Amino acid sequence: NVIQDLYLRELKDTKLAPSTLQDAEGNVKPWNPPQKPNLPELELQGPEALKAYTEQNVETAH
Amino acid sequence: VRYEASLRQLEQRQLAKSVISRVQSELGNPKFQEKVLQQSISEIEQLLSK
Amino acid sequence: STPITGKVTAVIGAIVDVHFEQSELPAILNALEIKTPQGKLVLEVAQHLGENTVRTIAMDGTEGLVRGEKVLDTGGPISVPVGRETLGRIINVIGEPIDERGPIKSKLRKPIHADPPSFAEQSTSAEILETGIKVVDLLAPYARGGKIGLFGGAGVGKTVFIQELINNIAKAHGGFSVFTGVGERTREGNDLYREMKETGVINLEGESKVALVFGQMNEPPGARARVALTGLTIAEYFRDEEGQDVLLFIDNIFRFTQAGSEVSALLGRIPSAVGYQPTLATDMGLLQERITTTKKGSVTSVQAVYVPADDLTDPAPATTFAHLDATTVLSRGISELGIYPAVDPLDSKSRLLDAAVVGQEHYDVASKVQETLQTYKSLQDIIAILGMDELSEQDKLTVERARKIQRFLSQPFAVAEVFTGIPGKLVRLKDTVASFKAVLEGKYDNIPEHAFYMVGGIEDVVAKAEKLAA
Amino acid sequence: EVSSILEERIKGVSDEANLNETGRVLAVGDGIARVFGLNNIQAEELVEFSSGVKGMALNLEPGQVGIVLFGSDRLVKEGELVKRTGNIVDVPVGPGLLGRVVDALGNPIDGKGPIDAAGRSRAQVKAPGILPRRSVHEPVQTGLKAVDALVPIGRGQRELIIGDRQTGKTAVALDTILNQKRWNNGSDESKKLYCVYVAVGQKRSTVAQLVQTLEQHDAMKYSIIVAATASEAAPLQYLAPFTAASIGEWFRDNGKHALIVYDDLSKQAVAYRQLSLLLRRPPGREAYPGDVFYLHSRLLERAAKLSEKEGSGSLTALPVIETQGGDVSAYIPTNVISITDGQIFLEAELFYKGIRPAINVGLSVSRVGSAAQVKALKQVAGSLKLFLAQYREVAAFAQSDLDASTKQTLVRGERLTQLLKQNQYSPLATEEQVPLIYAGVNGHLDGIELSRIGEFESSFLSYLKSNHNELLTEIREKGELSKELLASLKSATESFVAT
Amino acid sequence: AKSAANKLDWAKVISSLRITGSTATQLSSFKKRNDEARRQLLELQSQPTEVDFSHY
């Protein structure tokens, strides 16, 4: 009755205003994709290492 | 997704002021008078059905 | 001025009956204002007695009231102001700054009779708060969104406990906190205000990651009931509207009970057991239910409770005991032993204090601690009559460990720089679990008892062992 | 849009003509509106206000009918028209409530929409008489060994769960529900106990955790959670066990079996206290209403094992009473203790001593006891009662230079005490419960170190599962132990004990 | 692989049984044990490689 009148009128005559998209961006964290787990260096180099490892070793006790 | 859910609530509050506006419109218009006459005859029919 | 004008008919203390005019009636839980040279007295409408005569409860003092005094009707449930400009000022019950940090720059106002969230809204807990306090962390770990409860004697450093918690956890947390003090000393209030300005959490040159709502005991009982409600609504605004998680702190919730009991009597309700309000359960319940972790936020209440004459068999503490999720018992005896923590370790219980959820190692360690202490307590009777010497070797090793553990639970606090002066120590959760495991294994049974006493973590215990040694 | 859908639903409500018998509130205070009007009104009739609040009408006085409002007074106002709903309390009953968390009226608070409801039946109804009784013998196995052997009960029967405040009181209860899954899976509807947990005055979060745990153990598919939460008001709480019982009648009437756990009547009492005091009725002993006994007696006598003649059905019940600091002399406990057919009494020392379950079996009793319980389990647990009895007496002799006889008792007894520990929220299958106790009976566990009891237990079970799963199936299916079966079982135990 | 890493670690405990000293034995065993435990914990902890877009 009044229900029908109120509804018909309410829906029709009052148009939704959807939110500002900019504000939505604000309320989310923006995020651009993370980059690189890195390439870590090749452990040990030169005949410094070779000599060190061969020579230093004798680390068995008597 | 969170802001989307918030927007659903916000839509309801947007629609809340729309209810207030529509209430003011019904009570403003001589629909206030003319639909009261409609209610009167509807009650006459209802009460006659008793 | 509303044409809803009522004339007082009876001033019989807080009960003030008003005689609103024909047809015009407010509604239960509404707010009436009576303009006075003592601001506006707020009357919360609590009954209708009909014939356009309502019966309402006073909040502000009722002295000088003229019987027949015109009463405007605000028309709705007492609405406080909420915002992020409520942060950093002491707001009294009637929503007025009593620290005079100028008028609150309200965004929104809300009623203080906001309804608790529904079952659907609640989001199931699993977060683990950690306070960096060894007893708490190990023996009753806290959870974010929890309902921590500081059951204890009268201010048995109860305030001191809250101060430590705020000092560590609040500052650590980026979110807001809400410190609400219901009926605590106005001396103590000034110290807290100064102190939290000092900790800078209240920064008057900036914003504040905490708000204060201090209602103190010198305010009529009716106002005392709705100090809690007032604070709660600010927290809801934070949880909901700002979305941010918080850590609520309320003090002391026995005052909330006591206040409610008093105005029940005035309201004429037949007093229940130990004079408590018949509506005690629901009042506590509304308060607790309102505080919850939702899919909008998380609120971690820490509610001080004063346990009269240290009897938890008293119905008011016992009812609260059910209603809370992370109980703590602060025993006088343990305070007297000089240990601060004053906690009763066997009586600490928390919603999160599981097995796997606290970690298998943590669980096992804690099971061992509990047994050791429980044994020590059991053997205390044997030691009492028979004597210490009639115990076994296994028992003696257990006693030695228990005394060491007892004093290893001692952890200095920053808020005992006003006591001892000794700077606080706070030990991270992982570190505590590891350190306690060692002690139990007896890896630190080569460390003196007093080198655990009133010193923090394992590094400190070892260091104090060296210190005592030389 | 959500806006359009909501509008559609509301729009689809129009036209009134139902209102007839009006009342007008004279004064509304304390949730006790007092109306002059509603001349013809049934007692505890549902009434719908102008605000829309619903009530029952406990006081029918000569000039006023004192409606009790179920809801908040926030929207209620004085002088209000009070339409007469015209129905004394009735609740949907049906199979749909399986897997439904519902509020007292029945409105799902888990929002699982419409309920498959095969009746609306009144909530306050009279209990099954003398003639509706068949002999009680049907096992109730909770998967907790102490309960199952030391204090077991039959279906349709009472038995209190009176114990220390929130010491996992709900946890002790929850263990049973999980064990009902095993039987539930089985087709037979005597093995389908359709459980009801009645959460009275309980936080929505706490019950959410309960619900979540139940979902995890998939127990929701025979579980019903009747919820009167802490927020839910005292009228709902007052009717909460009664309403729940009516649901139980439908299953029972169908000849099926079910288990209703009223948790906790201590909060029910307080709600009744709130109602009575507010209705200005004189309060009984310990400020708990005088006719609270009458409420409890009506509720607790509805649990019944029906006659074969009137169809064998049952409605097992397990009321939970929260001991206020271990007080069992309190008025609400004393009354309940008399009505109940058994008690289980949780004990704080035991909890502290890491005995979980913390049940003190001395102060646990069953008045149905051995009448129901597996015959097999009866055979191998007569000894257990006697052994434990000695262990209790010789318990205090545990604190020096001790007699060999006492010391032997202590060895057997201590191992048993460790054995009855069970990691809460894990129930055990009876066909493996019988073996564990059997081992203890054969005293082969005397030779097992206390710490190694736990490891032994699971290992023994696995050893039985691989090696002697013939035995496990035999124990299960025979449900009885022949001397030959006990022989073979002993051999298996010996063999495992050796390793 | 990972079974190699841990097997040689424990093997080296019993090799150090037969060769006195373990000065850098423990450092080799420790390193292979560490990264083995890290990758197994990585692969089992592993969140998806990409975002979903089915439901959300």
Tab-separated table of C-alpha atoms in Angstrom, chain C residues 26-29 46-51 119-120 270 273 278 282 285 313 370-371, chain D residues 26-30 73-77 109 204 230-231 270 274 277 287 324 352:
chain	number	residue	atom	x	y	z
C	26	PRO	CA	10.775	9.396	25.772
C	27	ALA	CA	11.989	5.781	25.584
C	28	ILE	CA	14.009	3.467	27.786
C	29	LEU	CA	17.686	4.255	27.749
C	46	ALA	CA	15.141	3.871	32.741
C	47	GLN	CA	11.462	3.258	33.318
C	48	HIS	CA	8.165	4.638	32.333
C	49	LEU	CA	5.692	4.654	35.151
C	50	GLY	CA	2.987	5.969	32.825
C	51	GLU	CA	0.586	8.895	33.207
C	119	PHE	CA	27.527	-14.555	16.008
C	120	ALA	CA	28.092	-14.105	12.291
C	270	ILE	CA	15.138	-6.871	45.021
C	273	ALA	CA	23.184	-12.512	46.383
C	278	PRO	CA	19.772	-9.114	39.494
C	282	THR	CA	23.409	-9.141	31.684
C	285	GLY	CA	27.439	-9.679	29.542
C	313	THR	CA	34.047	-17.388	45.801
C	370	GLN	CA	53.538	-26.784	36.562
C	371	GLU	CA	54.330	-30.186	37.953
D	26	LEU	CA	0.742	0.848	31.692
D	27	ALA	CA	4.321	1.013	32.716
D	28	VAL	CA	7.364	-0.647	31.350
D	29	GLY	CA	10.259	-1.172	33.639
D	30	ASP	CA	12.740	-3.997	33.984
D	73	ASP	CA	13.401	-2.027	26.105
D	74	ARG	CA	15.192	0.391	23.804
D	75	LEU	CA	12.425	0.397	21.208
D	76	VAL	CA	9.712	-0.505	23.705
D	77	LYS	CA	7.697	2.457	24.998
D	109	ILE	CA	22.669	-17.509	14.264
D	204	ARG	CA	29.271	-15.934	20.826
D	230	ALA	CA	25.474	-14.322	26.959
D	231	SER	CA	23.910	-11.425	25.100
D	270	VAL	CA	20.707	-17.032	37.474
D	274	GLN	CA	16.601	-12.527	37.277
D	277	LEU	CA	13.159	-11.185	41.325
D	287	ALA	CA	18.715	-16.223	46.569
D	324	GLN	CA	31.360	-22.241	42.526
D	352	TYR	CA	47.260	-29.367	38.472
